């Protein structure tokens, strides 16, 4: 017996933090007002092909503040848990599966994709996309001294094993590069040097592994302003959209779009920007 | 298949032409329903040429999606606005099953939507506002909007009515919204023309098109307050009938092009300015 919704979310800064609980499981209690804040189960341990124990952690942020709007304007129940594989989704060829959180919400393990997840092509064909929470584009993380004029940079379109470029394994930013023959050249070098996650690539800038790090910007953009040792380049290419991830059949589909189109309207998709997004 | 399509004038998105004896270059031929006179109902459809941003998204989706259409103009209003309940303009269209998809300058809204199903957003839009460069003003927030009596003398701002902008200013600053009707416009036209004549001292409008203004203004002078900043930001989408068959291969295509940096072809060729 439960009409509770299952939310699927991930780790990224500053929509989704993930933090540990207190002796007692429960949250520090924090404030920007009250940070509210939700138990979310997820893996404790990373590393590919390593098993997988589910422990009860801490989420807050841009995302979950968008999570508990939905619901209460809803009027639904729900319980957060973490992406097992720690991937946002891509579909690989095995007979094609999704993985990540597209694999989640595709096989019911996720009634819900809560999370800056990028509407594309590929992942529309499957899933169902609420209107736009976010719109953003794709730009280039470097540290504070490296210089590049953009995606058309010869230090990119000729790649060498001098400068070091990649993006997230399993992204969209990998399914851009991958769709895109005009970009191919530059998807085969990132493919030798992609990160499990975007934090770990982020640090591997700031620990001079990675010369340049292709992300969404809402996320480069709020790391630039934190750490002054790291910078983004160029303009943005693929302006696209982050959106609610529901199955097709979904009940929910229609009034999750009206609520973020709400949310646009009456500012308080503008407040959960100056509250967590804006050296 | 072949699907009846409305849209409405609004440059760079829709641009009407008069025919050469046909429509040319990137022209598609578009109705447009003329009384012979006021004291009748009786008319005719004055055959016309479209072009423009959305005219181009239009030819992309007829090709990609494989649907051929009958193009015409709006004449019983403009955008959308709902009124006793029943709306007109290009929404009314679509509502009333006249037009099979409503194609143009067409911003994205909650109450739109209770009554249409819109396709992904294509075109980033809102809500700007324009003021000769030099103007002092924060943004829709600011005290000069807010509570325009507190100055000697007031703020003159308003909008061209009926449209999405002055619904969201009715709904979110009620006093504000009150005080600018006295300074309601016909157009954008007649909107600039104030603005550069000191009749007016700022424009609230549709961001797309007040960002495309800004950057193709004669010497510069006028300018969206901020770096072309957006309130309640939104979006343009092609309005489709409740449960419609063709949203999903339309949401697929306009995907498609932006993946395909198809999207960023058109911006460049319509959208980018001097300013
Ligand atoms: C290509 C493109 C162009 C404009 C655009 N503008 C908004 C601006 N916008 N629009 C809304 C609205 F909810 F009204 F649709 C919310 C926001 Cl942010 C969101 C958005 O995602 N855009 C997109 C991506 C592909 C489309 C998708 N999905
Ligand atoms: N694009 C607007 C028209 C202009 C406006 O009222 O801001 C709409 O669809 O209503």
């Given at each position: 017996m439960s009409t509770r919704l299952k939310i699927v979310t991930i780790h990224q800064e500053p929509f989704v933090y993930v933090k540990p609980t207190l002796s007692?499981?429960?949250?520090?209690?924090?404030?920007?007002?009250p940070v509210k804040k939700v138990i979310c189960t997820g893996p404790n341990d990373t590393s590919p092909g390593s098993p997988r124990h589910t422990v009860p952690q801490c989420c807050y942020g841009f995302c979950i503040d968008l999570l508990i709007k939905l619901a209460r304007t809803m009027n639904f129940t729900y319980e957060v848990h973490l992406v097992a594989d720690g991937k946002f989704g891509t579909q690989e060829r095995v007979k094609k599966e999704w993985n990540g959180m597209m694999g989640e919400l595709l096989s019911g393990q996720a009634d819900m994709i809560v999370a800056p997840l990028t509407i594309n092509n590929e992942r529309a064909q499957y899933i169902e996309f609420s209107k736009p929470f976010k719109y953003q584009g794709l730009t280039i993380l470097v540290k504070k001294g490296t210089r590049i004029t953009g995606i058309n940079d010869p230090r990119l379109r000729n790649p060498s094993d001098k400068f070091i470029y990649a993006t997230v394994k399993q992204s969209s930013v990998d399914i851009y590069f991958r769709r895109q023959v005009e970009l191919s050249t530059m998807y085969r070098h990132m493919e030798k040097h992609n990160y499990e996650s975007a934090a770990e690539a982020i640090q591997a800038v700031r620990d001079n592994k990675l010369h340049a790090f292709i992300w969404d910007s809402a996320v480069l953009e709020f790391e630039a302003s934190q750490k002054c040792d790291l910078v983004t380049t160029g303009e943005l290419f693929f302006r696209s959209g982050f959106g609610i991830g529901m199955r097709?059949?979904?009940?929910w589909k229609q009034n999750v779009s009206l609520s973020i189109l709400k949310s646009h309207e009456n500012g308080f998709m503008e407040d959960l920007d100056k509250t967590w997004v804006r050296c | 298949n072949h699907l009846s399509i409305v849209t409405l004038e609004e440059a760079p998105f829709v641009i009407v032409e008069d025919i050469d004896e046909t429509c040319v270059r990137n022209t598609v031929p578009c109705r447009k329903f003329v009384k012979?006179?006021?004291?009748?109902n009786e008319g005719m459809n004055v055959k016309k040429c479209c072009k423009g941003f959305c005219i181009d998204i239009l030819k992309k989706l007829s090709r990609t999606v494989k649907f051929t259409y009958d193009l015409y103009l709006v004449?019983?209003?403009?955008?959308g606005k709902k009124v006793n309940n029943v709306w007109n303009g290009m929404i009314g269209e679509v509502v009333y099953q006249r037009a099979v998809m409503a194609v143009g300058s067409l911003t994205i809204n909650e109450e739109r939507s209770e009554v249409v199903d819109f396709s992904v957003p294509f075109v980033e839009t809102g809500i700007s506002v324009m003021v000769?460069?030099?103007?002092?003003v924060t943004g829709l927030s600011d005290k000069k909007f807010q509570?325009?009596?507190?100055?000697?003398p007031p703020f003159r701002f308003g909008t061209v009515p009926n449209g999405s902008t002055e619904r969201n200013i009715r709904n979110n600053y009620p006093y504000m919204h009150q005080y600018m009707t006295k300074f309601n416009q016909k157009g954008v036209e007649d909107a600039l023309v104030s603005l550069k004549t000191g009749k007016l001292d700022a424009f609230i409008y549709d961001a797309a098109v007040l960002n495309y203004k800004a950057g193709r203004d004669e010497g510069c002078k006028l300018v969206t307050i901020g770096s072309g900043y957006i309130f309640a930001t939104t979006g343009y989408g092609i309005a489709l009938q409740?449960?419609?068959?063709w949203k999903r291969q339309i949401d697929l295509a306009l995907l498609q092009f932006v993946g395909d940096g198809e999207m960023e072809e058109l911006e460049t060729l319509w959208l980018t300015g001097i300013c």
């Open positions: 007692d499981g429960t949250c520090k209690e924090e404030f920007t007002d097709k059949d979904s009940p | 012979i006179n006021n004291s009748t004449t019983n209003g403009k955008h000769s460069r030099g103007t002092q509570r325009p009596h507190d100055y000697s409740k449960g419609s068959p």
